[PDB]
RNA sequence: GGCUAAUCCCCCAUGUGGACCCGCCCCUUGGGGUGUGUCCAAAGGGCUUUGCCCGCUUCCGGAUGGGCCCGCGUCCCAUCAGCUAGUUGGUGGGGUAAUGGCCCACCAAGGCGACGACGGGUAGCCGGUCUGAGAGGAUGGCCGGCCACAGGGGCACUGAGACACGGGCCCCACUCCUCGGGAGGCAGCAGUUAGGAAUCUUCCGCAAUGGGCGCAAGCCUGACGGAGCGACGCCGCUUGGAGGAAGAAGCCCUUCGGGGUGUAAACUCCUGAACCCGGGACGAAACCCCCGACGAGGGGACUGACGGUACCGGGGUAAUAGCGCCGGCCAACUCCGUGCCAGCAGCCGCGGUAAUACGGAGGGCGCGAGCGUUACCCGGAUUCACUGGGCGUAAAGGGCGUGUAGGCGGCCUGGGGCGUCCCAUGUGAAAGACCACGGCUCAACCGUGGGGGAGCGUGGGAUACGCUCAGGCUAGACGGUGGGAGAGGGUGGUGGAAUUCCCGGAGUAGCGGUGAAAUGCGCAGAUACCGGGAGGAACGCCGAUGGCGAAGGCAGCCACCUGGUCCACCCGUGACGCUGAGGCGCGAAAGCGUGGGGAGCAAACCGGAUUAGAUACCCGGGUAGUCCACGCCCUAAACGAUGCGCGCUAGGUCUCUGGGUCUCCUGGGGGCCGAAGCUAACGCGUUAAGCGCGCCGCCUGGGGAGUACGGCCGCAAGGC
RNA sequence: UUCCCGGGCCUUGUACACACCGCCCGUCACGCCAUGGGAGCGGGCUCUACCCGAAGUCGCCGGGAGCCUACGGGCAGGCGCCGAGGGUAGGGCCCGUGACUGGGGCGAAGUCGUAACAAGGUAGCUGUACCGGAAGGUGCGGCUGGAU
RNA sequence: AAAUG
């Protein structure tokens, strides 16, 4: 572009699209599970992954992943969630934070237990 | 022809790259003052006022390096690089403290000032700034 | 946001 | 309903002075100074008491705190393009400390906007803070500066100052107290509650600093000075230090020999966080008292919330470790379990029985009172590119002109000095940053100095380049005179070849068509042949790799109107130029409207074949349309997928059209191969995609999607 | 040596490279997500005209009439302009939501054919037009990013 | 002429 054109139209500053829309600014956000089921993932994986349809405090509803092996999460379980998606499960854009509200820690977990909300063992 | 000064600079730049002995440009007392620095700082042997078909020109006598060995005998250049700074589209002016150092002293910056056409070296001495005309090395 | 009877509403 | 004081209120006086009207002098917006008329002041209280102290009154200047006005700077959407009746200006007035349409009457018809008015969305702004090589981006919490608000709104009272957080009125919503209504306003300091992912003690003191009132002792101060909770952040410190086996057990690996944790431990000595005991602050010397004078000055005393705390001494116990990771980026490797399950995941990707990628374990790496995760900002992103990118084929040149604004612009001489450049000078608070010193045992934090800069006001200076005014020039540009080539454009006229149908003649058994066939046509006389008519549309040979046009596009021949353009001569004008958002015009085919026209051809449509099918390909039919006039539509592989003008950088060869001396030289077009150079390559290369300047248009991952919504255009189709 | 099966060398096209037993297109059936449209319904903001109108400053009155006096005056009191807001009516922008509907994205070891990439078996692509279960076909003109 | 994996 000529310099003149730049004086005229100027450069267009790029904008940023949040990948975590429902959070509405906040770091984490509280909610209740409406559905708790398993979803098969996209190719080339095969599994029955653990998810919850969750109703936010912003009166939103997101699909959120349940980490760990096994869970105490059910319909009507009050839960806390955090950002970050699960690439193989489209539409899952948030993770459940284990060890908060009616979300337990992973029983028998010994490695990297901060992530899985398990208190330090024997 | 919108910028006479760039033309000249480019006439030269174009000329050195096939290694013409010389090349003429249309005459101007300001084109001279610049050409003057170009020779006195040794980027050229020199120049002389001429005429073609009654038309004032400034024939510029070009300067080059020693022939080289290897698969490509073509010599190095005296003027490796000469390019406009200030342009009619965007005028460029520096103040004294803002006057740049070309290739770490190894080359010059011509600039038009209220005290004539000078080099970067020259301006910082006379303590002035001006329209930064171009950079050469 | 009304659920089957949960005192939690959302 | 009545009594009474004062620094409360009023009248007369006094008048240094001041206010006002009018004249005049200086000045120059309503600044000073005069003259005459007239108009205005006042408050006393104290002690030791022929005197000083706090008050009061009018005026003048200073100082500090302000009000108002102006220049420039300040976010996203143009899918917001028009906005405005106090609106813009004038006249007179009201109002104020004061200018002003601030308010009013009247008069004129103005004011604003692509340099983005109006409208919508978002935001208190700056010093600064964060990041960044910088340029820039992001941000404005704490502290300092200004503004704005005090439940939601309107108002004015008092006053130097308010239209007043803990003052007043009125309306609203809400809550509260027990029938007339009276009540409230934590966005002060704590505290409650709701909301939330989350955000503190209903602490201590006026000792310090600082504020109000007071002659003064002193009173008030949830400003403040301290303390409390919270690893929230940074900074300091600890859980030990020296010795200790060719090396305990346990656990992990193994080639069964061994290898690892690991000097690690155990065990030895030495130290001595915590804790006890004692002493124990700086922060605090002023006001006050005393001499002198209640001044200068010298001397007295008083008071510490934090606090029995820091800190300084005496004793003195070995005294918490966790978190993340170990496929690649990326530092850290091995067993078992599992078997596309369970699971990991930031991206590429791991798991299907031998997984360094899942879960445990041994071991290892990395940081450590922390380690990680989520969110957001800058970075890497030269991925909005000023520094510092691009568009033939990767995303990207507008289908083509003409031109408004704008941006940009040859040579020479001078005037101004606007940009530009130098110097002086003012400003640029403090804190923060930077360098140096210094104070808490260092540090964090804190003091004291030093360096300042951008930017703007002012004064001086310079004049190359940009600007501007003024003078000349001929190289750009445009004309004159003469001459050229050409399917350039418009109207009209008109010539032959062929297809078809019709008439006539002659003739007979098939013609047609395909891969092969069939449908079709044919004894009602087809085809093939001869003659004559009618009619529409396209112009063979010339014909080319050619020519013309800005593009679309233009082809028999003629005449007429008419554009572009090349050449020669070197006559004329003297920079009159280049580009060009909008605007306007043109714009193949198809399609649309109203009339014509309709031979050949041919979407749709029928039929015959093929085929599993055959809504196709092939064959026999055939309607729009193709043609003309006028009006629309405005698309494209509208392509050189290459915007336009200029300057500059080897040539070789083919060709079209000009001028020359005609071997050839010289212009303008069209091709090919190629110097230098470019390019990711392919390729480009004086017809640049090379080297440069000017201006415009455009790109910023794929899909969604040239879709939706809005808006404009259109009869519609549909276009932008 | 035309054909069928396989092979050698040169060359050309390619969207193949799991290498033609390759790739790949559209409808239709199912599941999930987001969006447009939709008789409407709910809200937020906003503009115009008019009715009523508190407190309050400003202005007129202060008289059949009260109080004060400093009475050519003041105060009470009365009228008026404007005025928070309230009300009626009609517009503009934004958000939410809606029976139903349109296509879109993803999902997948479904159903149909095979449009495109080799001359892809009718060269392709294109603007437009008409037609068709679907890819697509055909007409007109255009491009080579096609022929070998 | 002649489909698919
Ligand atoms: Mg799989
Ligand atoms: Mg897999
Ligand atoms: Mg861990
Ligand atoms: Mg008395
Ligand atoms: Mg008096
Ligand atoms: Mg008026
Ligand atoms: Mg006036
Ligand atoms: Mg006035
Ligand atoms: Mg006004
Ligand atoms: Mg009028
Ligand atoms: Mg706001
Ligand atoms: Mg604000
Ligand atoms: Mg950047
Ligand atoms: Mg702040
Ligand atoms: Mg602040
Ligand atoms: Mg308010
Ligand atoms: Mg208020
Ligand atoms: Mg409130
Ligand atoms: Mg209020
Ligand atoms: Mg006062
Ligand atoms: Mg107040
Ligand atoms: Mg108030
Ligand atoms: Mg205020
Ligand atoms: Mg209050
Ligand atoms: Mg209260
Ligand atoms: Mg509070
Ligand atoms: Mg609290
Ligand atoms: Mg809560
Ligand atoms: Mg605090
Ligand atoms: Mg005090
Ligand atoms: Mg004090
Ligand atoms: Mg207190
Ligand atoms: Mg701490
Ligand atoms: Mg040791
Ligand atoms: Mg050994
Ligand atoms: Mg060992
Ligand atoms: Mg051992
Ligand atoms: Mg083994
Ligand atoms: Mg051992
Ligand atoms: Mg002290
Ligand atoms: Mg005395
Ligand atoms: Mg003690
Ligand atoms: Mg001790
Ligand atoms: Mg001991
Ligand atoms: Mg020990
Ligand atoms: Mg880590
Ligand atoms: Mg690392
Ligand atoms: Mg490694
Ligand atoms: Mg298992
Ligand atoms: Mg892991
Ligand atoms: Mg395996
Ligand atoms: Mg294994
Ligand atoms: Mg592992
Ligand atoms: Mg890993
Ligand atoms: Mg630390
Ligand atoms: Mg980033
Ligand atoms: Mg950078
Ligand atoms: Mg650039
Ligand atoms: Mg790029
Ligand atoms: Mg294009
Ligand atoms: Mg167009
Ligand atoms: Mg112009
Ligand atoms: Mg100009
Ligand atoms: Mg110029
Ligand atoms: Mg100047
Ligand atoms: Mg400062
Ligand atoms: Mg020190
Ligand atoms: Mg300092
Ligand atoms: Mg002139
Ligand atoms: Mg002529
Ligand atoms: Mg016919
Ligand atoms: Mg006949
Ligand atoms: Mg002609
Ligand atoms: Mg002449
Ligand atoms: Mg002349
Ligand atoms: Mg033009
Ligand atoms: Mg057209
Ligand atoms: Mg047509
Ligand atoms: Mg039609
Ligand atoms: Mg028609
Ligand atoms: Mg017709
Ligand atoms: Mg048929
Ligand atoms: Mg057919
Ligand atoms: Mg046919
Ligand atoms: Mg036919
Ligand atoms: Mg017909
Ligand atoms: Mg072409
Ligand atoms: Mg392209
Ligand atoms: Mg153009
Ligand atoms: Mg073009
Ligand atoms: Mg041409
Ligand atoms: Mg040529
Ligand atoms: Mg030629
Ligand atoms: Mg070439
Ligand atoms: Mg080369
Ligand atoms: Mg050439
Ligand atoms: Mg050439
Ligand atoms: Mg290129
Ligand atoms: Mg990008
Ligand atoms: Mg995208
Ligand atoms: Mg996209
Ligand atoms: Mg379209
Ligand atoms: Mg559209
Ligand atoms: Mg629309
Ligand atoms: Mg129609
Ligand atoms: Mg149409
Ligand atoms: Mg377009
Ligand atoms: Mg063979
Ligand atoms: Mg052989
Ligand atoms: Mg081959
Ligand atoms: Mg190949
Ligand atoms: Mg829907
Ligand atoms: Mg909808
Ligand atoms: Mg009414
Ligand atoms: Mg009214
Ligand atoms: Mg009276
Ligand atoms: Mg009103
Ligand atoms: Mg109203
Ligand atoms: Mg009301
Ligand atoms: Mg809606
Ligand atoms: Mg709706
Ligand atoms: Mg096809
Ligand atoms: Mg095909
Ligand atoms: Mg086929
Ligand atoms: Mg084909
Ligand atoms: Mg093809
Ligand atoms: Mg077509
Ligand atoms: Mg058809
Ligand atoms: Mg069917
Ligand atoms: Mg065709
Ligand atoms: Mg090809
Ligand atoms: Mg196949
Ligand atoms: Mg099939």
- Residues with C-beta atoms within 5 A of ion ligand 3: A 112
CA distance A71 to B117: 82
DSSP conformational letter for B77: B
Give the H/E segment covering residue B121: helix B120-126
CA distance A41 to A50: 11
List the A109 CA – D30 C1' distance (angstroms): 89
Angle CA B10–B16–B19, to nearest 5: 150
Q: Hey, is B11 helix, strand or coil?
A: helix
Question: Token pair of B104, please?
Answer: 């770490």
Longest dimension (CA), chain C: 13
- What experiment produced this structure? X-ray
Q: How far is B47 from chain A (nearest CA, A)?
A: 34
Q: Across-strand partners of B12?
A: none
List the B88 CA – D596 C1' distance (angstroms): 63
Q: How many CA atoms are closer than 13 Å to the CA of A91, on its beta-carbon side?
A: 11
Torsion sign over Cα B64, B66, B67, B70 = negative
Per-residue 3-state assignment (H helix, E strand, C coil) for chain A: CCHHHHHHHCCCCCCCCCCCHHHCCCCCEEEEEEEEEEECCCCCCCCCEEEEEEEECCCCEEEEECCCCCCCCCCCCEEEEECCCCCCCCCEEEEEEEEEECCCCCCCCCCCCCCCCCCCCC
* Residue closest to B32 by CA, chosen among B54, B48, B11: B48
Same domain flag for B75 and B9: yes
Same domain flag for B102 and B52: no
CA distances from A8 to A1, A57, B47, B89, B91 (A): 11, 46, 42, 13, 17
CA distance A118 to B4: 77
CB atoms within 10 A of CB B58: 19
Contact C10 A56 (CB under 8 A): yes
Q: How many CA atoms are closer than 13 Å to the CA of B37, on its beta-carbon side?
A: 26
Question: Token pair of C5, please?
Answer: 């009877």
Same domain flag for B68 and B7: yes
Q: Hey, is B67 helix, strand or coil?
A: coil
- Do you find a cis peptide bond into A44, omega within 30 degrees of 0? yes
Question: Does residue B29 sit at the A interface (CB-CB below 8 Å)?
Answer: no
3-state helix, strand, coil in chain B (%, to 5): 30, 30, 40
| Contact assessment for residue A99 and residue A118, using Cβ atoms and an 8 Å cutoff | yes
Question: Token pair of A107, please?
Answer: 């029983």
Same domain flag for B64 and B91: no
User: Residue B108 contacts by C-beta under 8 Å, 6 or more apart in sequence?
Assistant: B37, B41, B102, B119, B120, B121, B135, B136, B137
Same domain flag for B85 and B63: no
The domain that holds B8 is classified in CATH as: 3.30.1370.30
Question: Does residue A81 sit at the C interface (CB-CB below 8 Å)?
Answer: no
Q: Which residues of A touch B89 (CB under 8 A)?
A: 2-4
CA distance B89 to A71: 68
* Residue closest to B63 by CA, chosen among B83, B47, B84: B47
* Residue closest to B95 by CA, chosen among B116, B113, B108: B113
Q: Which residues of C touch A59 (CB under 8 A)?
A: 1, 10
Contact A31 C3 (CB under 8 A): no
CA distance B72 to B89: 39
Contact C3 A76 (CB under 8 A): yes
Number of domains in chain B: 2
Looking at domain A1-122, its CATH superfamily turns out to be Nucleic acid-binding proteins (2.40.50.140)
Phi, psi at residue B68, to the nearest 5°?
-120, 160
CA distance B28 to B5: 10
DSSP conformational letter for B105: G
Query: Which range marks the domain in which residue B101 is found?
Result: 80-137
Question: Does residue A7 sit at the B interface (CB-CB below 8 Å)?
Answer: no
CA distance A116 to A68: 7
| Contact assessment for residue A81 and residue A31, using Cβ atoms and an 8 Å cutoff | yes
Residue ending a domain, choose from B41, B61, B79: B79
CA distance A74 to C4: 14
Q: Hey, is B27 helix, strand or coil?
A: coil
Contact A57 C10 (CB under 8 A): yes
Question: Does residue B2 sit at the A interface (CB-CB below 8 Å)?
Answer: no
Q: Which residues of C touch A55 (CB under 8 A)?
A: 1, 10
CA distance B53 to B40: 29
Residue ending a domain, choose from B37, B61, B79: B79
Question: Token pair of B96, please?
Answer: 């004294």
CA distance A93 to A65: 8
């Amino acid at each position: 572009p000529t310099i003149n054109q730049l004086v005229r139209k100027g450069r267009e500053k790029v904008r940023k699209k949040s990948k975590v829309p429902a959070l509405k600014g906040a770091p984490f956000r509280r909610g209740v599970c409406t559905v708790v089921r398993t979803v098969t993932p996209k190719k080339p994986n095969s599994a029955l992954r653990k998810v919850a349809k969750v109703r936010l405090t912003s009166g939103y509803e997101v699909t959120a992943y349940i980490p760990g092996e096994g869970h105490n999460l059910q319909e009507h379980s009050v839960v806390l969630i955090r950002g970050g998606r699960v690439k193989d499960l489209p539409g899952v854009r948030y993770h459940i934070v284990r060890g908060v509200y009616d979300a337990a820690g992973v029983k028998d977990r010994k490695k990297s237990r901060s992530k899985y909300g398990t208190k330090k063992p024997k | 022809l919108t910028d006479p000064i760039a033309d000249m600079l480019t006439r030269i730049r174009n000329a050195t790259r096939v290694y013409k002995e010389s090349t003429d440009v249309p005459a101007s007392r300001f084109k001279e003052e610049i050409l003057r620095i170009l020779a006195r700082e040794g980027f050229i042997k020199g120049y002389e006022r001429v005429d073609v078909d009654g038309k004032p020109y400034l024939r510029v006598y070009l300067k080059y390096g020693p022939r080289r060995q290897g698969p490509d005998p073509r010599p190095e250049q005296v003027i490796h690089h000469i390019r406009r700074i200030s342009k009619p589209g965007r005028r460029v002016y520096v103040g004294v403290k803002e006057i740049p150092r070309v290739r770490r002293g190894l080359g010059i910056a011509i600039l038009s000032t209220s005290k004539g056409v000078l080099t970067d070296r020259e301006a910082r001495k006379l303590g002035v700034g001006g329209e930064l005309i171009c950079e050469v090395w | 946001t009304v659920x089957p009877v949960x005192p939690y509403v959302x």
